CSV table of C-alpha atoms and ligand atoms in Angstrom, one decimal:
chain,number,residue,atom,x,y,z
N,1,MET,CA,-4.0,31.8,-96.4
N,2,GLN,CA,-2.4,31.9,-99.7
N,3,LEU,CA,-3.4,34.0,-103.4
N,4,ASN,CA,-2.4,34.1,-106.7
N,5,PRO,CA,-0.4,37.5,-107.1
N,6,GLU,CA,2.6,38.3,-108.7
N,7,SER,CA,3.8,34.5,-106.7
N,8,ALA,CA,3.7,33.6,-110.9
N,9,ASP,CA,8.1,34.5,-110.3
N,10,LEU,CA,7.8,32.1,-107.8
N,11,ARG,CA,6.7,29.4,-109.6
N,12,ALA,CA,8.7,31.1,-112.3
N,13,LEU,CA,11.6,30.6,-110.7
N,14,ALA,CA,11.4,27.1,-109.8
N,15,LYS,CA,10.2,26.1,-113.6
N,16,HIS,CA,13.8,27.3,-114.1
N,17,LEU,CA,16.1,26.0,-111.5
N,18,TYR,CA,14.4,22.7,-112.3
N,19,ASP,CA,15.7,22.9,-116.2
N,20,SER,CA,19.2,23.7,-115.3
N,21,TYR,CA,19.7,20.9,-112.2
N,22,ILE,CA,18.1,18.7,-114.1
N,23,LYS,CA,20.8,18.8,-117.7
N,24,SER,CA,23.5,20.4,-114.8
N,25,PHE,CA,23.9,16.4,-113.1
N,26,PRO,CA,23.6,12.6,-114.7
N,27,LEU,CA,21.1,10.9,-112.6
N,28,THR,CA,18.0,12.6,-111.6
N,29,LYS,CA,16.2,11.6,-109.2
N,30,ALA,CA,13.1,10.0,-110.4
N,31,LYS,CA,15.4,7.9,-113.8
N,32,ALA,CA,16.9,6.6,-110.1
N,33,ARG,CA,14.2,5.8,-108.1
N,34,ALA,CA,13.1,3.5,-111.5
N,35,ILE,CA,16.7,1.4,-111.7
N,36,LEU,CA,16.0,1.1,-107.4
N,37,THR,CA,12.5,-0.7,-109.0
N,38,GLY,CA,13.0,-2.3,-112.2
N,39,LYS,CA,11.1,-0.6,-114.8
N,40,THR,CA,14.2,0.5,-117.4
N,41,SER,CA,20.0,-3.4,-114.7
N,42,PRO,CA,22.7,-1.8,-112.8
N,43,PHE,CA,25.3,-4.9,-111.5
N,44,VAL,CA,25.6,-5.8,-108.0
N,45,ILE,CA,28.6,-5.5,-106.1
N,46,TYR,CA,28.0,-7.7,-102.7
N,47,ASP,CA,30.2,-9.3,-102.8
N,48,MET,CA,35.0,-8.8,-102.9
N,49,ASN,CA,34.0,-11.4,-105.9
N,50,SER,CA,31.3,-9.4,-107.1
N,51,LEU,CA,33.5,-6.0,-106.6
N,52,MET,CA,36.4,-7.7,-107.9
N,53,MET,CA,33.6,-9.0,-110.9
N,54,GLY,CA,32.7,-5.8,-111.0
N,55,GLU,CA,35.0,-3.5,-111.7
N,56,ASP,CA,34.9,-6.0,-114.8
N,57,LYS,CA,31.9,-5.3,-116.2
N,58,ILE,CA,31.0,-1.2,-115.5
N,59,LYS,CA,33.1,0.7,-117.5
N,60,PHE,CA,34.2,3.4,-114.6
N,61,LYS,CA,35.6,6.7,-116.3
N,62,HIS,CA,38.3,7.2,-113.8
N,63,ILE,CA,40.5,4.3,-114.5
N,64,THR,CA,42.1,3.5,-117.6
N,65,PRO,CA,44.3,-0.1,-118.3
N,66,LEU,CA,47.7,1.0,-118.8
N,67,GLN,CA,47.4,2.7,-115.4
N,68,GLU,CA,48.8,1.3,-111.7
N,69,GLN,CA,45.6,0.7,-109.7
N,70,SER,CA,46.0,-0.6,-106.2
N,71,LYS,CA,46.1,-3.4,-105.0
N,72,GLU,CA,43.6,-2.4,-102.3
N,73,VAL,CA,40.1,-1.8,-102.4
N,74,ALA,CA,39.6,0.3,-100.0
N,75,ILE,CA,41.9,2.5,-101.9
N,76,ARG,CA,40.7,1.9,-105.5
N,77,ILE,CA,37.3,2.7,-104.5
N,78,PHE,CA,38.5,6.2,-102.7
N,79,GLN,CA,40.0,6.9,-105.7
N,80,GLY,CA,37.1,6.7,-108.1
N,81,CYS,CA,34.8,8.6,-104.9
N,82,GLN,CA,37.8,11.4,-106.0
N,83,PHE,CA,37.1,11.7,-108.8
N,84,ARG,CA,33.8,11.9,-108.7
N,85,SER,CA,34.0,14.6,-106.5
N,86,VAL,CA,35.9,16.2,-108.0
N,87,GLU,CA,33.0,16.1,-111.4
N,88,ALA,CA,30.9,16.8,-109.1
N,89,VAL,CA,32.1,19.6,-107.8
N,90,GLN,CA,31.4,21.4,-111.3
N,91,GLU,CA,28.4,20.1,-111.9
N,92,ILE,CA,27.6,22.2,-108.2
N,93,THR,CA,29.6,24.8,-109.8
N,94,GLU,CA,27.5,25.3,-113.4
N,95,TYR,CA,24.3,25.0,-111.7
N,96,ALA,CA,24.7,27.2,-109.1
N,97,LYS,CA,26.0,29.4,-112.1
N,98,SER,CA,22.3,29.0,-113.3
N,99,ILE,CA,20.8,30.6,-109.9
N,100,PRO,CA,19.3,34.6,-110.6
N,101,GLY,CA,22.3,36.0,-109.7
N,102,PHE,CA,24.2,34.6,-108.6
N,103,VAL,CA,27.0,35.5,-111.1
N,104,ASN,CA,26.5,39.1,-109.8
N,105,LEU,CA,28.2,37.9,-106.2
N,106,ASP,CA,31.1,39.0,-105.6
N,107,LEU,CA,33.6,36.8,-107.5
N,108,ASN,CA,35.2,36.0,-103.5
N,109,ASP,CA,32.2,35.3,-101.9
N,110,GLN,CA,30.9,33.2,-104.1
N,111,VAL,CA,33.8,31.1,-104.4
N,112,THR,CA,33.3,30.4,-100.8
N,113,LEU,CA,29.6,30.1,-101.1
N,114,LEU,CA,30.0,26.9,-103.4
N,115,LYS,CA,33.4,26.4,-100.8
N,116,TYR,CA,30.6,25.1,-97.6
N,117,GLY,CA,27.9,24.4,-99.8
N,118,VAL,CA,29.4,21.3,-102.4
N,119,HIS,CA,29.4,18.4,-100.1
N,120,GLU,CA,26.2,19.6,-98.5
N,121,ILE,CA,24.5,19.7,-101.4
N,122,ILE,CA,26.5,15.7,-102.8
N,123,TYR,CA,25.2,14.3,-99.6
N,124,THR,CA,21.7,15.4,-100.1
N,125,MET,CA,22.4,14.5,-104.0
N,126,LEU,CA,23.4,11.0,-103.3
N,127,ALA,CA,20.1,10.0,-101.4
N,128,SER,CA,18.6,10.2,-104.3
N,129,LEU,CA,20.5,7.8,-105.6
N,130,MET,CA,20.5,5.5,-101.9
N,131,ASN,CA,17.9,3.0,-100.9
N,132,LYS,CA,18.1,0.8,-97.7
N,133,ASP,CA,20.4,-1.9,-99.3
N,134,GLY,CA,22.6,0.4,-101.0
N,135,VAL,CA,23.6,3.2,-104.1
N,136,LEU,CA,23.5,3.6,-107.6
N,137,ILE,CA,26.9,3.7,-108.7
N,138,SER,CA,28.2,4.7,-112.6
N,139,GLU,CA,25.5,6.6,-113.6
N,140,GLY,CA,23.3,3.5,-112.5
N,141,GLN,CA,25.6,0.7,-114.3
N,142,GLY,CA,26.7,-0.9,-110.4
N,143,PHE,CA,24.7,-1.3,-107.3
N,144,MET,CA,26.8,-1.3,-104.1
N,145,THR,CA,25.3,-2.1,-100.9
N,146,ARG,CA,25.3,-0.8,-97.5
N,147,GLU,CA,27.1,-3.8,-95.6
N,148,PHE,CA,29.8,-5.2,-98.1
N,149,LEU,CA,30.6,-1.1,-97.8
N,150,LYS,CA,30.6,-1.0,-93.5
N,151,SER,CA,33.3,-4.2,-94.1
N,152,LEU,CA,35.7,-2.9,-95.7
N,153,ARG,CA,38.9,-2.2,-93.4
N,154,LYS,CA,39.5,0.3,-91.0
N,155,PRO,CA,37.7,3.5,-90.4
N,156,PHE,CA,36.7,2.9,-94.9
N,157,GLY,CA,34.0,1.2,-93.6
N,158,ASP,CA,32.6,4.3,-91.8
N,159,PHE,CA,32.5,6.5,-94.2
N,160,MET,CA,29.9,6.2,-95.9
N,161,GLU,CA,27.4,4.9,-93.0
N,162,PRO,CA,26.6,8.2,-92.0
N,163,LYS,CA,25.4,8.5,-95.4
N,164,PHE,CA,23.2,5.7,-95.3
N,165,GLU,CA,21.0,7.1,-92.2
N,166,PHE,CA,20.8,10.5,-93.2
N,167,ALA,CA,19.3,8.9,-96.7
N,168,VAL,CA,17.1,7.3,-94.9
N,169,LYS,CA,15.2,10.0,-93.3
N,170,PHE,CA,15.6,12.5,-95.9
N,171,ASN,CA,14.2,10.3,-99.0
N,172,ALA,CA,11.0,9.7,-96.3
N,173,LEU,CA,10.1,13.3,-96.8
N,174,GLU,CA,9.4,11.7,-100.3
N,175,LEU,CA,11.3,14.4,-102.7
N,176,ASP,CA,10.8,15.0,-105.6
N,177,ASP,CA,13.7,16.8,-108.4
N,178,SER,CA,10.8,19.7,-108.4
N,179,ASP,CA,11.7,20.0,-105.1
N,180,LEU,CA,15.6,19.7,-104.9
N,181,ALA,CA,16.0,22.0,-107.2
N,182,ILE,CA,15.1,24.5,-105.2
N,183,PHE,CA,16.5,23.2,-102.6
N,184,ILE,CA,20.4,22.6,-103.5
N,185,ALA,CA,20.1,26.5,-104.5
N,186,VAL,CA,19.1,27.6,-100.7
N,187,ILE,CA,22.6,25.4,-99.7
N,188,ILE,CA,24.4,27.1,-101.9
N,189,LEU,CA,23.7,31.1,-100.9
N,190,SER,CA,23.3,29.9,-97.0
N,191,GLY,CA,24.1,33.4,-95.9
N,192,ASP,CA,26.3,32.5,-92.6
N,193,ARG,CA,29.1,30.5,-94.6
N,194,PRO,CA,32.5,31.8,-93.2
N,195,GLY,CA,34.4,35.1,-94.6
N,196,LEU,CA,31.6,35.9,-96.7
N,197,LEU,CA,32.1,40.1,-96.8
N,198,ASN,CA,28.7,40.8,-98.9
N,199,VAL,CA,26.1,39.4,-96.6
N,200,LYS,CA,23.4,41.4,-97.6
N,201,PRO,CA,22.4,40.4,-101.8
N,202,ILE,CA,23.4,36.7,-100.4
N,203,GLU,CA,20.5,36.6,-98.0
N,204,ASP,CA,18.2,38.4,-100.6
N,205,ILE,CA,18.7,35.5,-103.1
N,206,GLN,CA,18.2,33.1,-100.7
N,207,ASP,CA,14.8,34.7,-99.3
N,208,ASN,CA,13.8,34.8,-102.8
N,209,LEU,CA,14.9,31.0,-103.2
N,210,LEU,CA,13.2,30.1,-99.9
N,211,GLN,CA,9.7,32.1,-100.5
N,212,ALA,CA,9.6,30.4,-103.6
N,213,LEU,CA,10.5,26.7,-101.9
N,214,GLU,CA,7.7,27.2,-99.6
N,215,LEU,CA,5.2,27.9,-102.8
N,216,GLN,CA,6.1,24.6,-104.5
N,217,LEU,CA,6.2,22.5,-100.4
N,218,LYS,CA,2.9,23.0,-100.5
N,219,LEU,CA,2.0,23.1,-103.9
N,220,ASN,CA,3.4,19.5,-104.6
N,221,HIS,CA,2.9,18.5,-100.6
N,222,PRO,CA,-0.6,18.7,-99.8
N,223,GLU,CA,-0.5,15.6,-97.8
N,224,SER,CA,2.1,16.5,-95.3
N,225,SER,CA,2.5,20.7,-94.0
N,226,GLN,CA,4.9,21.4,-91.9
N,227,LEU,CA,7.7,20.1,-94.7
N,228,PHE,CA,8.8,23.2,-94.5
N,229,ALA,CA,10.0,23.5,-91.5
N,230,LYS,CA,11.4,19.4,-91.9
N,231,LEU,CA,13.5,21.1,-95.2
N,232,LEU,CA,15.8,23.5,-92.9
N,233,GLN,CA,16.3,21.7,-90.2
N,234,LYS,CA,17.8,19.4,-92.6
N,235,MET,CA,20.0,22.1,-93.5
N,236,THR,CA,21.4,21.9,-90.2
N,237,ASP,CA,21.9,18.0,-89.6
N,238,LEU,CA,23.6,18.5,-93.4
N,239,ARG,CA,26.7,20.7,-91.9
N,240,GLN,CA,27.0,17.8,-88.9
N,241,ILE,CA,27.9,14.9,-91.4
N,242,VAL,CA,30.5,17.2,-93.5
N,243,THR,CA,31.9,17.3,-90.0
N,244,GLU,CA,32.0,13.2,-89.3
N,245,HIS,CA,33.3,13.2,-92.9
N,246,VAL,CA,35.8,16.2,-91.8
N,247,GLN,CA,37.6,14.2,-89.2
N,248,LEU,CA,36.8,11.0,-90.0
N,249,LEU,CA,39.6,12.3,-93.3
N,250,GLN,CA,42.2,13.5,-90.5
N,251,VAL,CA,41.9,10.0,-88.9
N,252,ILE,CA,42.9,8.6,-92.3
N,253,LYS,CA,44.7,11.1,-93.2
N,254,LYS,CA,47.3,11.0,-89.9
N,255,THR,CA,47.8,6.9,-91.5
N,256,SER,CA,46.6,12.1,-101.6
N,257,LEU,CA,44.0,14.2,-102.1
N,258,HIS,CA,43.6,16.1,-105.4
N,259,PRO,CA,43.6,20.0,-105.4
N,260,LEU,CA,40.4,21.3,-106.4
N,261,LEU,CA,39.3,18.6,-103.4
N,262,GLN,CA,42.5,19.8,-100.9
N,263,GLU,CA,41.6,23.0,-101.9
N,264,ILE,CA,37.9,23.0,-100.7
N,265,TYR,CA,39.0,21.1,-98.0
N,266,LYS,CA,41.3,23.1,-96.6
N,267,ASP,CA,40.8,26.1,-93.7
N,268,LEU,CA,36.6,25.0,-94.3
N,269,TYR,CA,35.0,25.7,-90.6
G,1,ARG,CA,44.0,29.5,-102.3
G,2,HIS,CA,40.7,28.5,-104.2
G,3,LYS,CA,42.7,29.3,-107.5
G,4,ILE,CA,40.8,25.8,-109.1
G,5,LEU,CA,37.9,27.0,-107.5
G,6,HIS,CA,38.1,30.4,-108.4
G,7,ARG,CA,39.1,29.6,-112.3
G,8,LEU,CA,36.0,27.2,-112.6
G,9,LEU,CA,33.4,30.3,-111.6
G,10,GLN,CA,35.5,32.7,-114.0
G,11,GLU,CA,33.9,31.0,-116.9
Z,1,F5A,C1,36.6,12.4,-102.2
Z,1,F5A,C2,37.0,12.7,-100.9
Z,1,F5A,C3,37.8,14.0,-100.2
Z,1,F5A,O1,36.7,12.1,-99.0
Z,1,F5A,C4,35.8,10.6,-99.7
Z,1,F5A,C5,35.8,9.7,-98.9
Z,1,F5A,C6,35.5,8.9,-98.9
Z,1,F5A,C7,34.2,8.8,-99.6
Z,1,F5A,C8,33.5,7.8,-99.6
Z,1,F5A,O2,32.6,7.5,-100.0
Z,1,F5A,C9,34.0,6.1,-99.8
Z,1,F5A,C10,34.0,5.1,-98.3
Z,1,F5A,C11,34.9,3.8,-98.6
Z,1,F5A,C12,36.1,4.0,-99.6
Z,1,F5A,CL1,36.2,2.1,-98.9
Z,1,F5A,C13,35.9,4.2,-100.4
Z,1,F5A,C14,35.7,6.0,-100.0
Z,1,F5A,C15,34.1,9.8,-100.1
Z,1,F5A,C16,34.7,11.1,-100.2
Z,1,F5A,C17,35.9,13.7,-100.8
Z,1,F5A,O3,34.7,14.2,-99.3
Z,1,F5A,O4,35.1,14.4,-102.0
Z,2,F5A,C1,26.0,14.6,-107.6
Z,2,F5A,C2,26.2,13.3,-107.2
Z,2,F5A,C3,25.6,13.3,-106.2
Z,2,F5A,O1,27.7,13.0,-107.5
Z,2,F5A,C4,28.2,12.3,-106.6
Z,2,F5A,C5,29.9,12.6,-105.5
Z,2,F5A,C6,30.2,12.1,-105.1
Z,2,F5A,C7,29.9,11.0,-104.3
Z,2,F5A,C8,30.6,10.2,-103.3
Z,2,F5A,O2,31.3,10.3,-102.3
Z,2,F5A,C9,30.6,8.4,-103.8
Z,2,F5A,C10,30.5,7.6,-102.3
Z,2,F5A,C11,30.7,6.4,-101.6
Z,2,F5A,C12,30.3,5.6,-103.6
Z,2,F5A,CL1,30.4,3.6,-103.7
Z,2,F5A,C13,30.4,6.7,-104.6
Z,2,F5A,C14,30.7,7.7,-104.6
Z,2,F5A,C15,28.4,10.5,-105.3
Z,2,F5A,C16,28.0,11.3,-106.2
Z,2,F5A,C17,25.6,12.2,-108.3
Z,2,F5A,O3,26.5,11.3,-109.1
Z,2,F5A,O4,24.3,12.6,-108.3
Z,3,F5A,C1,31.8,8.9,-112.2
Z,3,F5A,C2,31.9,7.2,-111.4
Z,3,F5A,C3,30.4,7.3,-111.5
Z,3,F5A,O1,32.7,7.7,-110.4
Z,3,F5A,C4,33.0,6.4,-110.2
Z,3,F5A,C5,32.9,7.4,-108.4
Z,3,F5A,C6,32.6,5.5,-107.3
Z,3,F5A,C7,33.3,4.4,-108.0
Z,3,F5A,C8,33.3,2.8,-106.9
Z,3,F5A,O2,32.2,3.0,-106.5
Z,3,F5A,C9,34.1,2.0,-107.7
Z,3,F5A,C10,33.7,1.4,-107.1
Z,3,F5A,C11,34.6,-0.7,-107.9
Z,3,F5A,C12,35.7,0.0,-107.9
Z,3,F5A,CL1,37.1,-1.8,-108.1
Z,3,F5A,C13,36.6,1.2,-107.7
Z,3,F5A,C14,35.9,2.1,-107.6
Z,3,F5A,C15,33.6,4.0,-109.3
Z,3,F5A,C16,33.2,5.1,-110.3
Z,3,F5A,C17,32.4,7.2,-113.0
Z,3,F5A,O3,33.6,6.5,-113.1
Z,3,F5A,O4,31.6,5.8,-113.9
């Protein structure tokens, strides 16, 4: 079945992806997992009282005492998420650059690739910070409960719920950072994003990422065959939630956002 | 469009 030939590179690929992955992002899944269980204490926001007291105890990077904050928790929260998304786009861009061969793609296609993959890999990586009760925030300094989010007014309460539903099923796969490094790499190099004009060199890379992932999944998960196909089917699900997130943006929008994000959502799908 | 993104790839 499986041999030990020049698959040494496949493993060389995964090591390289892991090493830049672990320094590209703040909180690895390993680290967040330890916080979600104890060994290491975030402030828990379950309450409007805990909210109002959370913004006091937690040091959010996007806020400064001198600036005007909207009297509107739903809006003060969207603010932080926008700031974090802007930062996440930059961290994902840096990671994309470390994927062997990416920087030699046509720069117009690197842009297209990053445009469609960012939020998918954002939702993928968000699960690493979630359990069934809530999600870690502020580099693990805070913890916002799932049920408090759902209680926010009007449509904002419907933003994070699909993400929780995704994370629950997705975390049951019990992937680790080493697996996550190669999976997001496979996401970024999706050769079926709309608007690509030099596909073949992208597919060639994705295949190398795909077979490196499969080999990684067999070596690291003896207790579950078909983990590979299950992940691929997850990439299908990540697209649907993006489609469902945009429609929600529209609802709110017809009732703004950082030029980088507006740049990303403009003419998406 | 994609000028902010295009700029980040150029680094
Ligand atoms: C930032 C932007 C453009 O749009 C988002 C809008 C909302 C969320 C939330 O998760 C959220 C949930 C509840 C509240 Cl009250 C506030 C925010 C995340 C992203 C994106 O897609 O990058
Ligand atoms: C890379 C990643 C996943 O970056 C994030 C980017 C965007 C968000 C959000 O959209 C969000 C939604 C709800 C809340 Cl309460 C807070 C943030 C979260 C994390 C990380 O940090 O590992
Ligand atoms: C980079 C990071 C994690 O970005 C945030 C993303 C989301 C939030 C929130 O979920 C939130 C909760 C309550 C309030 Cl009042 C405001 C914002 C905060 C910060 C930060 O800045 O540390």
